[PDB]
Design a protein around this ligand. Structure first.
Ligand SMILES: [Cl-]
Length: 342
């Protein structure tokens, strides 16, 4: 008995349906009773910030139901300032118990066309992060089933609490899954994209850039998934599994890369194609303004039974024991939260 409180569609003939997702959401009664919105197939050019708890979106299909907007961190607002990384997000989850199913969320920033522009072209953006989905610190218990997240740089920004991605497709280039949140991905396609602007022997990107605080037990946890390249032109050994992101943070002794943001990315029972070369390091600025490198061997980067040509042949890729692997069940990672659809 699945009941939709509202229906969004492109038809002005579909009946008492909404034209945009924002309107359908705004029709929700104040409070925290569950509210479910069916989004009929179509491309909805909208940027949404979810502040209503217990809101649930269901698209007619992951392939046909799309929420898309083109915004880069470097994209300028009316006042001439930049949107920023968080601000470029097509969808921002700032409420609890959100769920999206069978739909696609895209940031349509044309990263390749931007990279192809001449350097003297004043419209060529440097701050090229363009987030498709951002789960903020106010978005605990965000659930995404049969959802597709599309972007290049910084596709998925997960911060704060717990989020679960099941049977999803996430595509990107650089740090396309990043943040400090507890994000569990099960049975997902993590799609590494082609970079026309990167020479074949250089790094095209990194699947993850966790910023997990050292005291947080779980960061980015990918299980029973597939790490694949979007095309045969993605070179062998062009993608890192992860890179340690230590966010510039304000401390009583200055603003610089957080030394305690010792990120975690763990893969279990996940296939990896040949584009993966292993983990990588990342640089930031320390308390003195010097360049500092945060190394993978100093981060919580682990694998358990990866397979495929991209899996570990060498030993500089730490492996979990069977006992340690048992600590990465959905129950343990998500704790008191059991993700369920309306
Ligand atoms: Cl930063």
């Amino acid at each position: 008995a699945t009941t939709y409180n509202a229906v969004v569609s492109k038809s002005s003939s579909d009946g008492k349906t909404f034209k945009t997702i924002a309107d359908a959401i705004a029709s929700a009664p104040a409070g925290s009773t569950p509210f479910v919105i069916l989004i009929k197939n179509g491309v909805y050019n909208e940027r949404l910030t979810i502040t209503r708890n217990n809101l649930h979106l269901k698209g007619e299909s992951r392939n046909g139901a799309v929420i898309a907007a083109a915004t880069a961190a470097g994209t300028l607002k009316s006042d001439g300032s930049k949107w920023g990384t968080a601000g470029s997000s097509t969808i921002t989850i700032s409420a609890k118990d959100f769920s999206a199913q069978s739909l696609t969320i895209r940031n349509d920033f044309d990263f390749p066309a931007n990279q192809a522009k001449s350097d003297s072209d004043s419209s060529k953006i440097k701050d090229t992060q363009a987030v498709a989905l951002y789960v903020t610190k106010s978005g605990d218990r965000a659930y995404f089933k049969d959802v597709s997240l599309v972007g290049y740089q910084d596709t998925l920004y997960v911060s704060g609490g717990r989020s679960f991605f099941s049977d999803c497709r996430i595509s990107g280039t650089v740090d396309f899954i990043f943040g400090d949140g507890t994000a569990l991905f099960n049975n997902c396609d993590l799609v590494s994209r082609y970079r026309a602007d990167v020479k074949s022997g250089n790094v095209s990107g990194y699947l993850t850039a966790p910023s997990t605080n050292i005291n947080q037990k779980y960061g980015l946890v990918i299980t029973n998934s597939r790490v694949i390249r979007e095309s045969d032109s993605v070179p062998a050994k062009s993608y890192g599994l992860g890179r340690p992101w230590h966010p510039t943070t304000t401390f009583s002794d200055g603003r610089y890369a957080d030394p305690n943001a010792i990120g975690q990315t763990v893969f279990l029972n996940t296939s990896m194609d040949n584009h993966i070369y292993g983990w990588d390091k990342m640089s930031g600025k320390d308390k003195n303004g010097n360049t500092i490198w945060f190394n993978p061997e100093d981060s919580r980067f682990f694998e358990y039974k990866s397979y495929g040509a991209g899996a570990a042949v060498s030993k500089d890729r730490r492996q979990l024991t069977d006992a340690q692997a048992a600590e990465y069940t959905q129950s343990k990672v998500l704790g008191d939260w059991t993700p369920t659809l309306p």
